[PDB]
């Protein structure tokens, strides 16, 4: 799918390793911020910077 590419849409559904107290767990792309800054939410609610180094869609 990917190595490190940023294809990330807002409306995507994706893993994305949140905190290392948790590990993968599965977000959405909310929006694409200021310069890459995206912005995904996990299902708790909270948004956080993800980057192509903490997400992976499909793989």
Same mark, same amino acid.
């Given at each position: =799918?990917? +190595? ?6 807002? #409306? ?6 949140? =905190? ?6 599965? +977000? ?5 911020? =200021? #310069? #890459?800054?995206?912005?995904?939410? =996990?299902?708790? #609610? ?14």
């Amino acid at each position: =799918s990917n +190595a490190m590419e940023l294809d990330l849409q807002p #409306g995507d559904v994706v893993k994305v390793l949140e =905190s290392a107290a948790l590990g993968w767990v599965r +977000a959405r792309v909310i929006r694409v911020k =200021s #310069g #890459g800054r995206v912005v995904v939410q =996990s299902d708790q #609610g909270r948004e956080f910077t993800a980057r192509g180094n903490q997400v992976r869609l499909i793989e």
